[PDB]
Design an enzyme around this catalytic site. Structure first.
Site, PDB file in Angstrom:
ATOM      1  N   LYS A 189       5.377 -24.590   4.354  1.00 43.06           N
ATOM      2  CA  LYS A 189       5.346 -23.122   4.061  1.00 43.06           C
ATOM      3  C   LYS A 189       5.828 -22.282   5.214  1.00 43.06           C
ATOM      4  O   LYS A 189       5.648 -22.693   6.388  1.00 43.06           O
ATOM      5  CB  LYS A 189       3.938 -22.739   3.603  1.00 43.06           C
ATOM      6  CG  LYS A 189       3.504 -23.655   2.433  1.00 43.06           C
ATOM      7  CD  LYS A 189       2.685 -23.025   1.331  1.00 43.06           C
ATOM      8  CE  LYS A 189       2.237 -24.073   0.313  1.00 43.06           C
ATOM      9  NZ  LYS A 189       2.368 -23.564  -1.066  1.00 43.06           N
TER      10      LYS A 189
ATOM     11  N   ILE B 123      -2.657 -22.484  -1.619  1.00 42.91           N
ATOM     12  CA  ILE B 123      -2.306 -22.536  -3.036  1.00 42.91           C
ATOM     13  C   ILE B 123      -1.381 -23.740  -3.179  1.00 42.91           C
ATOM     14  O   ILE B 123      -0.198 -23.621  -2.897  1.00 42.91           O
ATOM     15  CB  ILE B 123      -1.637 -21.224  -3.496  1.00 42.91           C
ATOM     16  CG1 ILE B 123      -2.600 -20.067  -3.346  1.00 42.91           C
ATOM     17  CG2 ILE B 123      -1.229 -21.297  -4.998  1.00 42.91           C
ATOM     18  CD1 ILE B 123      -1.986 -18.677  -3.407  1.00 42.91           C
TER      19      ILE B 123
ATOM     20  N   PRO C   5      -1.383 -20.384   3.507  1.00 49.42           N
ATOM     21  CA  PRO C   5      -2.511 -21.230   3.855  1.00 49.42           C
ATOM     22  C   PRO C   5      -3.374 -20.594   4.935  1.00 49.42           C
ATOM     23  O   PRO C   5      -2.944 -19.651   5.636  1.00 49.42           O
ATOM     24  CB  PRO C   5      -1.872 -22.480   4.398  1.00 49.42           C
ATOM     25  CG  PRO C   5      -0.532 -22.541   3.663  1.00 49.42           C
ATOM     26  CD  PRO C   5      -0.123 -21.142   3.474  1.00 49.42           C
TER      27      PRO C   5
ATOM     28  N   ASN D 132     -13.053 -29.115   5.292  1.00 48.06           N
ATOM     29  CA  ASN D 132     -13.137 -28.926   3.847  1.00 48.06           C
ATOM     30  C   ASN D 132     -11.800 -28.362   3.357  1.00 48.06           C
ATOM     31  O   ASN D 132     -11.337 -27.366   3.857  1.00 48.06           O
ATOM     32  CB  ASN D 132     -14.285 -27.978   3.472  1.00 48.06           C
ATOM     33  CG  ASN D 132     -15.646 -28.598   3.649  1.00 48.06           C
ATOM     34  OD1 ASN D 132     -16.631 -27.882   3.980  1.00 48.06           O
ATOM     35  ND2 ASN D 132     -15.755 -29.864   3.387  1.00 48.06           N
TER      36      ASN D 132
END
Lengths: 114, 114, 114
Positions: free
Chosen positions: C32, C64, C1, C97
């Site tokens: 993660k 992802i 990320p 975002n």
């Protein structure tokens, strides 16, 4: 909405009032309330367009809706016009990426707009 | 196409010719004329990758088509190679986000590419 | 990320462990390993939110997977919390975002994650 401009034009060539002008014009163009319009200008960048370091800009406009073929054409006319007039950037040396954001993918005020 | 690199590498470590090399190599890789290629390098950034401050890069490549599984693998090899050779950034400390842009969502020259 | 914060807050107001805090909190939140987390903070920006130049931030989180309605609400609480506590930015002056990236569209280590 959120509008970001990255450019190699120097800071001193960004006129006073440019962020306010972008805010007001974007509220006019998008129909979105002005309280939700964010604007961001990044001068003095190391960039080239078509291999040349003449004035150029790489931009992004994100919005939850109000994005589409005809609308983007209108935003491009407006925003290229502003970059030409205020920063002396040729419109053929400007790219603007448009993003229609899903409300669930925009965080604000501890939550999302979903 | 549009290629942007953000890195903690200092400005002085970006060699002469780096933007031009990116431009030529992306034109080759993407099969697009160099006149359409824009490049943007942002050094001196405050960033970490995997919880460490060693050299790293966060990048974006936007293109109207020429984006896909095999093509992106090829761009990643090319671009990591250049970032290793020129900026001394380990390829395992580089992320490149690829974006296949719709022509209607790219503004240029007072309109869009639609 | 990958988490990127652009803000008008000055560099001196970013506390020295902020990138490490973001790294550890995002590893926790996303589930993660911290080795996959990249973080990027850009102070001293020329920006406005709602026409006003009071402290604000425009952010991005790309991952992802681990993106979705409920998760993004949780990240927004976390990240607005951190920006309020550490940078003294009001949560109603922050945009984040969120991007759920396809593995084929993320380059790394000379290839992609596909």
């Amino acid at each position: 909405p959120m509008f970001i401009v990255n450019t190699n034009v120097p800071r001193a060539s960004v006129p006073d009032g440019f962020l306010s002008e972008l805010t007001q014009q974007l509220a006019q163009a998008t129909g979105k309330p002005p309280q939700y319009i964010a604007v961001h200008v990044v001068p003095d960048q190391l960039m080239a367009f078509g291999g040349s370091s003449e004035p150029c800009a790489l931009c992004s406009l994100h919005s939850i809706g109000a994005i589409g073929g005809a609308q983007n054409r209108s935003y491009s006319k407006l925003l290229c016009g502003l970059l030409a007039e205020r920063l002396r950037i040729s419109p053929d040396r400007v790219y603007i990426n448009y993003y229609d954001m899903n409300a669930a993918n925009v965080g604000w005020n501890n939550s999302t707009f979903a």
